[PDB]
Design a protein around this ligand. Sequence first.
Ligand SMILES: *CCC(=O)N1CCC[C@@H]1c1ccccc1
Length: 149
Amino acid sequence: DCEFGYIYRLAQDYLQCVLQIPQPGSGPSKTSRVLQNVAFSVQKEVEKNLKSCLDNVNVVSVDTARTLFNQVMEKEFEDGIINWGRIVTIFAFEGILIKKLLRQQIAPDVDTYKEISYFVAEFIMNNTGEWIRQNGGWENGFVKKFEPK
Ligand SMILES: *CCC(=O)N1CCC[C@@H]1c1ccccc1
């Protein structure tokens, strides 16, 4: 579950949750279901904490969203420590980017969420995939930590 396909589906499911368009095909997994609740809570918190910065920028295109994602993500992981709360922050931030793009993207495209999901899955896989596998993946690591007791 640390491979690209699995993480891309998590990132895509989260953007569909934010855009209020869940896919009517099979329905999100147990992992996705737990992640959507935790990531949405962090997203509301980050939206409040980053309000002065977010107002300062207009997310006019996917390249702008990528630049903002890299600047937040580069500082979130610079001390080299990886933990599940930091990984939830990646999804929370992609949710903020898709909201900002929906309102501010100059040339709207219905596939924009798939492009943001791809670069989010690339970041998670390249920067944290090794750590995720060693810590039980999504099913024996993440879900065990964040599912209800
Ligand atoms: C929070 C720092 C800030 O004001 N800005 C504006 C330009 C880039 C940066 C930013 C980073 C993350 C979210 C929003 C803005």
